[PDB]
């Protein structure tokens, strides 16, 4: 069993209650599968985006 060293501030009203509450943070929890990024609509090459004729002032 592994040693824990809870660090807390003097401001805390309740030093005694920190262990049952921090008991929650140390607990491992059921992890969601690793979602990976994938573009919904990939670079197409046959579909052309609509570009406005006008151009920016670029002051």
């Amino acid at each position: 069993t592994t040693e824990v060293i809870l660090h807390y501030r003097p401001c805390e009203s309740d030093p005694t209650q920190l262990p049952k509450i921090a008991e929650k943070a140390i607990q491992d929890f059921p992890t969601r599968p690793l979602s990976r990024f994938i573009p919904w609509f990939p670079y197409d090459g046959s579909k052309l985006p609509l570009r406005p004729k006008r151009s920016p002032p670029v002051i």
Binding site: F37, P52, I59
Partner: protein, 188 residues
């Protein structure tokens, strides 16, 4: 046009914020503003500001009708070549709800400078609107305001070399599905 009204206000913020982050335009023009409860720098320049509002106004009819597939804010250099693309894939399937969902995107736009390679001096930007259907309907529909016309973009305009992907954020709401990623040219 329940949803589409929100997207234009949102897109306008991103387009302005995007310029500030990539230093497309000198910083003198931009003015700090609180949009979406974030501090973002919008522009306070008239020639550019109308260009922006005019571009998105032309997109709403396609968003009201969900003719829009994605909207890409492209940064162009002196040679008018693509350097970075801010892709915004959009799929459309309580009012202050979504206004909180989108806020993630602003945050991730504002932190992209650390991760994107620095761009070349005197860059200029543009918008690409990829329609859902390649049909003519959208090409005549998109030109609401006259004196500001749209065209088709050639490969020269859209093709980028040695593109890299920097994902920014993905959300999957019941009312709006959206993705934001940046394609960056390896050599600039």
């Amino acid at each position: 046009q329940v949803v589409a009204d929100v997207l234009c206000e949102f897109l306008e913020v991103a387009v302005h914020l995007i310029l500030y982050v990539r230093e497309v335009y000198p910083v003198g023009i931009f003015q700090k503003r609180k949009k979406y409860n974030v501090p973002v720098q919008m522009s306070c320049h008239p020639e550019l500001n109308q260009y922006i509002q005019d571009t998105l106004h032309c997109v709403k009819p396609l968003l009201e009708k969900n003719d829009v597939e994605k909207v890409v804010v492209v940064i162009l250099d002196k040679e008018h070549r693509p350097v970075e693309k801010f892709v915004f894939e959009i799929t459309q399937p309580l009012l202050s709800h979504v206004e909180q969902l989108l806020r993630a995107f602003i945050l991730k736009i504002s932190v992209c400078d650390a991760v994107l390679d620095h761009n070349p001096p005197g860059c200029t930007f543009t918008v690409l609107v990829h329609t859902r259907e390649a049909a003519t309907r959208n090409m005549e529909k998109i030109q609401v305001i006259k004196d500001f016309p749209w065209i088709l973009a050639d490969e020269q305009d859209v093709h980028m070399h040695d593109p890299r992907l920097i994902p920014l954020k993905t959300m999957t709401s019941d009312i709006l599905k959206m993705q934001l990623y940046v394609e960056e040219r390896a050599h600039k």
